[PDB]
Design a binder for this molecule. Structure first.
Ligand SMILES: O[C@H]1[C@@H](O)[C@@H](O)[C@@H](O)[C@@H](O)[C@H]1O
Ligand SMILES: O[C@H]1[C@@H](O)[C@@H](O)[C@@H](O)[C@@H](O)[C@H]1O
Length: 497
């Protein structure tokens, strides 16, 4: 029973200009966290997003999401003048945010080139030089994507798709301004996050980052390093990621993400992963990795297959990779997302390296006392993270409302065994958060929607649903001291303060 933190993607922060940003409201959430006894702030992947707006399908495994840039500081410097397009409240309007914030950032870039001090123009220069190894490909990637009507890289003219030496240099020369712009967006993002990170550290708060084990097909790194992935000559994946048919899905899941050529990454001492983790550790203190099981083995699906039925398991060099990580960083600040159908082999790898696993209370009541998500079954070392629900789950109140008769009843009886009782429906989220903090899990993390006991409309992501995801936002003044105080109380009572 060491500590607890809260889960809130930066986009959910309240504030003007269409979305949560790395500014004052963000710093405000830090104070809230501090005064609430919280010691962790978990977020979703922070890279640039494409269609669907999912943080797990980023245009780059290294880049930073421009949408998170707080335009206010840039306004205070005279680089740009802002006028609101009519953004709504409590939700992100991505369509509108795209049409507005990009030109907004572009305009602010012109202000910078004409009013930036030497120390500013110099810093921007150092940044471009130091992050060049990935920044160069990223900036050109985005630029070329705009220049081609948003077409995916493997749909661009042969010369550019195959990254021919000449074509690249020419494009890189006749679009140096757009390329500089994108680099500018990155410069702001990392500098703004950096400030926020130091802030959190001074308050004694650690950041729990996130990253999908597999990258997106249409992204800077796949374009610039196709040797690391199973692609044909046209740049199209010959096999895609996914999971096999299980008790639930009768056809399994076909994600479409490109699969790694593990043999190639190994011959290079897993350079990609080390670089990927090094860059994440610049932003986070702990890094959760989605679909951890992939390091043990992954389900390879023929690209020509419409479902996941035709796949097969393929072992991945997990042991070697983590051994390498251990030596590279002298530690392994990884957080294993081991939800779903896991095997003894996956647990073996996870445990063998002392990596903490996950526990989701919303999944603990559809069976009997042997459910590994029920608190009494948590490993004695308590090296695990308990959640009421994650971003992919409905809010706890929303889950409760639709849960089966068995789950609802078992929930009550189980809570009772722990001296926890509830009357009102809106009380459920707190009963579970309480159960979480009372457990052996050294760390408990809760999404803010549960702290506010919001219903299903505040659900961050609904797997399978083709819209309305990643949009939920706290409304101004919605979260209040009242909530922080109640959390502090619960944390003190369980010894997590
Ligand atoms: O490392 C320490 C230790 O575990 C303490 O018993 C307590 O839990 C602290 O908060 C921290 O976690
Ligand atoms: O007020 C805002 C923010 O909420 C924090 O208080 C930060 O430290 C600054 O004061 C900022 O201007």
């Amino acid at each position: 029973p060491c500590a607890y933190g809260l889960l809130l993607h930066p986009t959910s922060l309240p504030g003007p200009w269409g979305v949560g940003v790395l500014g004052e409201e963000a710093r405000g959430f830090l104070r809230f966290l501090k005064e609430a006894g919280a010691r962790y702030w978990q977020v979703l992947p922070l890279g640039p997003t494409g269609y669907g707006d999912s943080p797990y399908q980023s245009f780059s495994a290294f880049a930073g999401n421009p949408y998170l840039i707080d335009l206010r500081p840039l306004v205070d410097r005279g680089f740009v003048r802002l006028e609101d397009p009519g953004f709504p409240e409590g939700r992100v309007d991505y369509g509108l945010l795209y049409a507005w914030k990009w030109p907004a950032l572009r305009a602010a870039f012109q202000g910078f080139r004409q009013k930036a001090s030497p120390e500013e123009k110099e810093d921007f220069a150092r940044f471009q030089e130091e992050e060049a190894w990935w920044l160069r490909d990223y900036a050109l990637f985005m630029t070329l994507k705009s220049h081609h009507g948003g077409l995916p890289w493997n749909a661009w003219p042969l010369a550019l798709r195959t990254r021919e030496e000449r074509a690249l240099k020419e494009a890189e020369a006749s679009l140096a301004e757009e390329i500089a712009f994108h680099a500018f967006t990155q410069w702001l993002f990392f500098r703004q996050w950096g400030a926020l990170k130091e802030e959190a550290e001074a308050l004694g708060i650690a950041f729990i980052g996130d990253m999908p084990i597999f990258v997106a097909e249409d992204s800077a790194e796949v374009w610039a390093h196709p040797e690391w992935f199973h692609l044909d000559e046209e740049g199209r994946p010959t096999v895609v990621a996914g999971v096999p048919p299980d008790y639930f899905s009768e056809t399994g899941q076909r994600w479409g993400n490109p699969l790694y050529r593990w043999e190639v990454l190994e011959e290079e001492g897993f350079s990609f992963w080390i670089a990927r983790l090094r860059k994440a550790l610049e932003l986070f203190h702990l890094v959760r990795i989605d679909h951890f099981r992939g390091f043990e083995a992954y389900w390879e699906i023929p690209a020509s297959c419409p479902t996941a039925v035709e796949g097969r398991w393929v072992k991945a060099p997990g042991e070697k990779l983590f051994a390498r990580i251990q030596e590279a960083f002298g530690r392994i600040p990884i957080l294993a997302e081991d939800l779903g159908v896991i095997t003894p082999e996956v647990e073996a790898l996870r445990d063998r390296f002392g990596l903490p696993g996950m526990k989701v209370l919303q999944f603990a009541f559809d069976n009997g006392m042997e459910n590994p998500f029920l608190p009494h079954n948590y490993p004695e070392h308590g090296r695990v993270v308990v959640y009421t629900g994650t971003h992919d789950n409905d809010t706890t109140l929303g889950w409760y409302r639709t849960a089966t008769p068995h789950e609802r009843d078992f929930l009550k009886r189980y809570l009772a065994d722990w001296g926890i009782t509830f009357r009102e429906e809106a009380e459920v989220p707190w009963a579970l958060m309480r159960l979480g903090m009372a457990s052996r899990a050294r760390l408990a993390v809760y999404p803010v929607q549960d702290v506010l006991a919001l219903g299903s409309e505040a659900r961050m992501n609904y797997p399978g649903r083709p819209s309305g995801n990643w949009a939920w936002r706290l409304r101004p003044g919605e979260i209040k001291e009242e909530h922080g105080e109640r959390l502090l109380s619960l944390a003190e009572a369980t010894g997590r303060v």
